[PDB]
Amino acid sequence: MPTLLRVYIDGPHGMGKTTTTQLLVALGSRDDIVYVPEPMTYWRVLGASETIANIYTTQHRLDQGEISAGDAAVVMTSAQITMGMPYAVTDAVLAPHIGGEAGSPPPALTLIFDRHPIAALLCYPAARYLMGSMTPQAVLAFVALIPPTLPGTNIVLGALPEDRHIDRLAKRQRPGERLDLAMLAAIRRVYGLLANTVRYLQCGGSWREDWGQLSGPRPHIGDTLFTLFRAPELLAPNGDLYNVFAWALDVLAKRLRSMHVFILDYDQSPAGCRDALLQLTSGMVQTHVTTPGSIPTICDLARTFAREMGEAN
Amino acid sequence: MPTLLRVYIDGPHGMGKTTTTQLLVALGSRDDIVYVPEPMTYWRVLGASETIANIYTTQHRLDQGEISAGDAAVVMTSAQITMGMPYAVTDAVLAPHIGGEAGSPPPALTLIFDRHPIAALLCYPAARYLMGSMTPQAVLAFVALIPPTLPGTNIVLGALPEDRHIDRLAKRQRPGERLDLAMLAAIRRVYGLLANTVRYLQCGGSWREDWGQLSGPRPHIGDTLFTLFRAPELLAPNGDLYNVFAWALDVLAKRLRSMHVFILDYDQSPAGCRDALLQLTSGMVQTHVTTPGSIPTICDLARTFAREMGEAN
Numbered sequence: 313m314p315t316l317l318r319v320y321i322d323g324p325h326g327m328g329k330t331t332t333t334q335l336l337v338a339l340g341s342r343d344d345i346v347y348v349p350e351p352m353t354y355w356r357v358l359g360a361s362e363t364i365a366n367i368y369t370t371q372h373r374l375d376q377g378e379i380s381a382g383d384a385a386v387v388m389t390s391a392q393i394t395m396g397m398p399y400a401v402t403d404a405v406l407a408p409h410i411g412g413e414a415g416s417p418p419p420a421l422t423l424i425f426d427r428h429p430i431a432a433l434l435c436y437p438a439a440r441y442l443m444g445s446m447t448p449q450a451v452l453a454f455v456a457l458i459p460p461t462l463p464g465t466n467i468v469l470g471a472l473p474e475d476r477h478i479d480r481l482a483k484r485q486r487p488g489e490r491l492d493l494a495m496l497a498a499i500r501r502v503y504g505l506l507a508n509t510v511r512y513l514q515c516g517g518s519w520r521e522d523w524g525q526l527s528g529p530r531p532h533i534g535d536t537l538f539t540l541f542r543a544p545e546l547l548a549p550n551g552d553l554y555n556v557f558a559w560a561l562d563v564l565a566k567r568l569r570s571m572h573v574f575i576l577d578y579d580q581s582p583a584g585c586r587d588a589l590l591q592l593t594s595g596m597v598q599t600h601v602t603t604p605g606s607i608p609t610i611c612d613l614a615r616t617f618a619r620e621m622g623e624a625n
Numbered sequence: 626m627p628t629l630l631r632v633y634i635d636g637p638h639g640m641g642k643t644t645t646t647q648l649l650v651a652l653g654s655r656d657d658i659v660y661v662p663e664p665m666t667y668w669r670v671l672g673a674s675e676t677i678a679n680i681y682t683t684q685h686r687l688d689q690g691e692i693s694a695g696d697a698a699v700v701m702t703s704a705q706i707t708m709g710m711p712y713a714v715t716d717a718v719l720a721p722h723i724g725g726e727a728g729s730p731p732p733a734l735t736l737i738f739d740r741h742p743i744a745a746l747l748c749y750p751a752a753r754y755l756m757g758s759m760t761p762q763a764v765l766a767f768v769a770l771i772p773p774t775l776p777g778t779n780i781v782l783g784a785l786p787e788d789r790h791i792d793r794l795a796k797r798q799r800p801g802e803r804l805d806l807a808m809l810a811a812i813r814r815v816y817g818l819l820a821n822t823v824r825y826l827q828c829g830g831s832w833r834e835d836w837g838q839l840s841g842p843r844p845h846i847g848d849t850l851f852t853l854f855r856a857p858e859l860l861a862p863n864g865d866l867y868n869v870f871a872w873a874l875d876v877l878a879k880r881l882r883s884m885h886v887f888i889l890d891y892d893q894s895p896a897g898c899r900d901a902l903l904q905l906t907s908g909m910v911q912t913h914v915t916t917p918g919s920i921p922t923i924c925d926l927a928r929t930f931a932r933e934m935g936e937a938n
């Protein structure tokens with residue numbers, strides 16, 4: 313029986329992330345490590361043309377009052393659909409090879425991913441929800457879609473003080489991307505409410521038993537994303553969310569409840585960061601692979617991905 | 626051990642469907658039958674305002690050359706997202722109660738659903754793909770999303786000659802819906818290519834081993850939806866689809882492969898139709914329910930749904 317360690321490096325944009333991955337795989341470590349980059353080529357080319365562009369453009373156009381919110385909403389939403397597709401189809405072809413969580417022995421393979429599905433399917437959609445560019449209802453469709461959480465889902469988030477983080481963002485700018493402090497501060501809030509609802513849920517937290525606290529480190533319903541959904545458009549005349557929306561919070565729960573969050577302090581020098589990441593690795597969960605031939609396939613798969621969609625490495 | 630029979634009545638729009646459901650549940654049959662309607666209230670109100678409207682409007686606007694395809698594409702796509710959400714969140718809260726397929730004994734509960742997820746997540750998105758209103762790439766994101774097919778997924782499709790079907794469509798018109806023969810003929814083609822790929826796959830059909838036939842009742846790759854994806858935008862310079870798109874066909878497969886299609890001849894009088902539907906029921910698959918208390922919950926769930934979203938019954 314073998315294990316394969318999957319590490320899902322995430323958090324908001326411009327926080328040492330891609331820098332510390334190529335510095336972690338630079339250690340000359342044998343090919344037991346498979347690094348998969350952002351699906352950027354899907355983004356810029358094969359998916360749509362400069363999808364990144366639209367997101368950041370449609371915002372200026374929105375902020376500078378040149379479209380109705382419902383206009384920014386609809387583009388902002390296909391922006392998201394097209395953003396996530398590539399994270400999903402992968403996760404689809406990787407699922408049938410993932411056996412149980414054999415605790416934390418050495419993994420015969422270690423996948424280091426640049427961003428995990430819920431970045432494009434929950435986090436950003438939620439940030440735009442706060443940015444007036446995404447609709448509560450649309451946000452929860454992505455929520456209602458988030459594929460079943462697989463075993464061994466170790467998600468590595470981040471930590472850097474607003475200031476030094478801002479400074480970092482302003483030292484590199486993406487292809488067709490603008491600089492947005494609100495959208496920044498926004499994401500930083502989703503990446504907290506999220507890495508907070510895990511902790512909370514993991515500790516027996518139930519959004520339904522806690523709802524009326526919202527009405528008016530051990531976190532409460534108030535520190536969870538669940539707050540963001542106490543929006544007018546989702547509440548019936550009785551003040552209770554409609555069940556359409558209600559059930560979907562249950563879905564959302566069951567997805568986050570089973571995740572393995574860790575948070576690396578990006579406050580250090582690139583090398584040390586990766587050292588830390590490397591150390592976090594130890595206590596992470598590893599999983600058996602259903603088919604004995606799975607590992608190689610799980611290799612090719614991600615290797616093929618990074619071949620076809622990594623404008624990074 | 627109990628079983629619960631789930632029947633997913635589908636096929637294109639305006640084909641006796643909603644008529645024959647309310648005629649099937651009209652038999653006075655005890656409350657062991659739970660009928661769940663289309664989530665229309667989500668559609669018209671709580672989801673977005675007159676979503677149905679946009680689909681059919683954005684088309685005229687497209688056909689009458691008043692928007693770029695990429696304009697119709699983006700609305701047409703959120704139209705779809707918002708259409709399907711309600712089918713999904715349900716399927717999410719229904720999954721954790723579905724145990725294995727105990728073959729075809731009597732079910733302690735029978736759910737009769739008006740349309741199944743892949744109507745809003747594969748079929749229509751695919752029809753618009755043919756209607757110039759949906760992009761190949763967007764179509765395959767919904768494909769890459771189609772939640773894992775649960776056991777006991779008996780999908781009831783339909784049969785009525787184009788002519789008599791057209792005549793039927795023109796005897797009732799939806800809230801903010803227009804009459805489109807192409808969009809009609811289109812859907813009728815998706816509902817065939819789909820109920821065809823099942824048969825084909827079920828018979829050992831592999832899209833990859835069959836691909837080069839496309840290049841240039843026992844059906845071939847040419848009778849499958851797989852044809853629709855042999856579009857320019859998905860093919861690399863070598864002519865092979867890119868793996869992003871490639872894997873997603875694999876996803877699509879694994880979803881359809883496990884479905885239980887049946888097709889009722891809608892050519893009869895309403896009563897008899899339902900009699901037939903009733904007979905099809907017999908040979909359908911039933912499933913055990915993981916939690917012993919599942920059945921009641923599976924009752925309330927769908928009953929609550931139809932309470933909150935059934936502008937039909």
Ligand SMILES: Nc1ncnc2c1ncn2[C@@H]1O[C@H](COP(=O)(O)OP(=O)(O)O)[C@@H](O)[C@H]1O
Nearest residue numbers: 325326327328329330331480483484580581582
């Ligand atoms: N430890 C660090 N010290 C100083 N600058 C850093 C450090 N890590 C990343 N940066 C820089 O800050 C920006 C954000 O990092 P990057 O890896 O490029 O992005 P992201 O975190 O969004 O994936 C980049 O310009 C990068 O060079």
Ligand SMILES: Nc1ncnc2c1ncn2[C@@H]1O[C@H](COP(=O)(O)OP(=O)(O)O)[C@@H](O)[C@H]1O
Nearest residue numbers: 638639640641642643644793796797893894895
């Ligand atoms: N067996 C039938 N004989 C004659 N007319 C029918 C029959 N079944 C349905 N219709 C009519 O044709 C239209 C399509 O049926 P309906 O149940 O309303 O829609 P749908 O099939 O799209 O769910 C309706 O106007 C309906 O009254």
Ligand SMILES: O=c1[nH]c(=O)n([C@H]2C[C@H](O)[C@@H](COP(=O)(O)O)O2)cc1I
Nearest residue numbers: 325326330367395427431432436486489
């Ligand atoms: O769902 C998403 N939405 C989004 O707007 N981005 C933007 C943020 C940033 O401009 C770029 C991702 O680059 P970095 O993660 O390297 O910062 O795409 C990324 C994802 I995933």
Ligand SMILES: O=c1[nH]c(=O)n([C@H]2C[C@H](O)[C@@H](COP(=O)(O)O)O2)cc1I
Nearest residue numbers: 638639643680708740744745749799802
């Ligand atoms: O994914 C979908 N896309 C779509 O355009 N419709 C339209 C077709 C028709 O106008 C109406 C559904 O009504 P009937 O199924 O009763 O025909 O919504 C429905 C679904 I589900």
